[PDB]
Amino acid sequence: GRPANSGFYVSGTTLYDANGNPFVMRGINHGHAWYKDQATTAIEGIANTGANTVRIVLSDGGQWTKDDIQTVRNLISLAEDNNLVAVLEVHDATGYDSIASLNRAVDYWIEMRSALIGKEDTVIINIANEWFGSWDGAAWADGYKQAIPRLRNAGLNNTLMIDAAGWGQFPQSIHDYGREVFNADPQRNTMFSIHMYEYAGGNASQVRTNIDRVLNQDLALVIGEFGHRHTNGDVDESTIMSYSEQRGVGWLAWSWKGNGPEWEYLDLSNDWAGNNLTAWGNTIVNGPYGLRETSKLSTVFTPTTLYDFEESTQGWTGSSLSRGPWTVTEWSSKGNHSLKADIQMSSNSQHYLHVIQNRSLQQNSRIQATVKHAGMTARLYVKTGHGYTWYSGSFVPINGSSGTTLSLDLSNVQNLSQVREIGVQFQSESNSSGQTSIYIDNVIVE
Ligand SMILES: [Ca+2]
Ligand SMILES: [Cl-]
Ligand SMILES: [Cl-]
Numbered sequence: 082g083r084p085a086n087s088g089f090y091v092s093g094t095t096l097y098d099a100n101g102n103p104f105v106m107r108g109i110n111h112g113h114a115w116y117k118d119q120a121t122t123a124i125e126g127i128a129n130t131g132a133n134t135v136r137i138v139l140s141d142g143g144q145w146t147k148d149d150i151q152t153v154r155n156l157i158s159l160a161e162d163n164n165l166v167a168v169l170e171v172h173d174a175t176g177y178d179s180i181a182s183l184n185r186a187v188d189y190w191i192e193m194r195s196a197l198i199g200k201e202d203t204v205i206i207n208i209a210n211e212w213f214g215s216w217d218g219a220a221w222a223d224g225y226k227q228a229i230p231r232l233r234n235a236g237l238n239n240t241l242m243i244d245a246a247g248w249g250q251f252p253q254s255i256h257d258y259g260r261e262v263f264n265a266d267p268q269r270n271t272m273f274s275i276h277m278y279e280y281a282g283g284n285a286s287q288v289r290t291n292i293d294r295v296l297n298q299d300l301a302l303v304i305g306e307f308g309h310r311h312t313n314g315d316v317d318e319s320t321i322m323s324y325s326e327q328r329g330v331g332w333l334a335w336s337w338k339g340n341g342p343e344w345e346y347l348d349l350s351n352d353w354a355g356n357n358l359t360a361w362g363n364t365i366v367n368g369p370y371g372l373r374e375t376s377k378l379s380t381v382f383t384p385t386t387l388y389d390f391e392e393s394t395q396g397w398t399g400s401s402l403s404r405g406p407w408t409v410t411e412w413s414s415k416g417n418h419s420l421k422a423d424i425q426m427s428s429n430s431q432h433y434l435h436v437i438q439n440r441s442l443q444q445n446s447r448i449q450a451t452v453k454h455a456g457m458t459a460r461l462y463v464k465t466g467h468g469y470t471w472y473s474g475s476f477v478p479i480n481g482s483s484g485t486t487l488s489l490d491l492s493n494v495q496n497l498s499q500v501r502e503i504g505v506q507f508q509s510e511s512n513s514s515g516q517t518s519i520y521i522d523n524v525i526v527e
């Protein structure tokens with residue numbers, strides 16, 4: 082932020098991969114330009130988190146050491162070899178209003194075109210990180226209206242990504258002029274990015290409205306950068322992650338490692354290898370709506386009852402659901418109600434029903450729940466600690482005629498006093514397809 086003192090294509094609000102399958106970015110930003118020797122270690126580390134995309138910081142020589150074409154080719158290779166989509170971006174014009182800085186970035190992409198042309202199915206070009214620091218939508222648009230044509234004229238066919246003005250925190254620029262910028266692309270293959278920090282994502286209302294204001298212009302969107310907090314305030318990362326999942330919006334967390342003292346709290350990993358994630362890193366990778374739960378690789382590469390649901394859904398949510406969850410009387414194992422959700426099955430597809438809530442299950446030694454579907458397998462799980470550490474039983478077969486009781490032994494679970502989430506992971510079989518419903522009832526601990 083500013084000082085404290087045949088390939089990808091866009092269709093409406095959806096970004097599609099080369100196979101015609103929607104692609105929802107779930108990834109991490111890596112500050113390559115400042116730490117060039119960490120390329121292999123960092124990208125492999127990021128791949129291990131389950132991320133499906135890595136945004137790579139490049140320098141065109143304006144402020145740091147220019148990344149030459151061999152470096153660009155190597156970075157793309159590392160991403161590809163690890164099944165990661167690469168969003169490349171030039172960082173030297175960050176916060177600048179000058180057309181000169183933007184033109185230098187454009188000249189850079191043109192110079193490196195031989196490493197980008199032919200990589201349309203795996204590489205997306207983010208023209209310039211946070212170009213135009215002022216909050217002026219018209220001036221911002223004028224810059225890109227001249228830049229986009231230049232890029233296309235040079236032969237670049239990659240999907241282009243455009244950062245909003247105001248250091249990325251002025252999404253109104255996209256709502257007001259995004260369509261004009263998009264129409265400046267003869268290939269109509271441009272998407273937009275918001276950097277949600279303390280101004281653009283300060284609270285739940287801002288996160289939702291800012292995302293809606295870009296999408297309602299029928300433009301594809303990604304939260305290119307976001308954190309759990311920033312220079313002048315808190316950032317609602319929880320809503321960014323939950324709402325982005327609801328609306329199919331991509332996101333990329335900032336950043337793997339290497340932030341300066343003023344922003345060191347934004348490092349996702351303590352080590353370059355990624356063997357020791359920070360709390361922020363665990364929120365992104367292992368937390369609710371995180372990488373482990375929602376990231377899908379581009380297809381180009383591939384005794385007390387806690388919940389009875391008798392009066393409400395009791396705070397439960399889920400992911401990879403078509404509709405729901407709802408509390409219904411259609412089926413139940415205890416009382417007259419159960420939690421129900423609809424899902425679309427696909428080969429080995431995974432679906433979730435979970436209650437995100439801090440609580441203590443200390444003293445408890447077991448947790449179980451009864452589930453069923455309208456083949457499938459399922460397992461009960463819990464997450465504990467600041468690291469959202471996962472603990473689950475083994476996947477067991479469930480059926481559609483009656484309920485199957487799932488169980489998890491808590492005797493060996495650490496930090497039970499710090500439970501963060503409780504849920505059931507449903508997994509379709511290899512030859513499973515079609516619509517069905519999943520249910521859960523009588524969640525009890527002893
Ligand atoms: Ca019940
Ligand atoms: Cl919309
Ligand atoms: Cl939606």
Ligand code: NA
Nearest residue numbers: 082211276306
């Ligand atoms: Na930034």
Ligand code: NA
Nearest residue numbers: 309316317318
């Ligand atoms: Na926060």
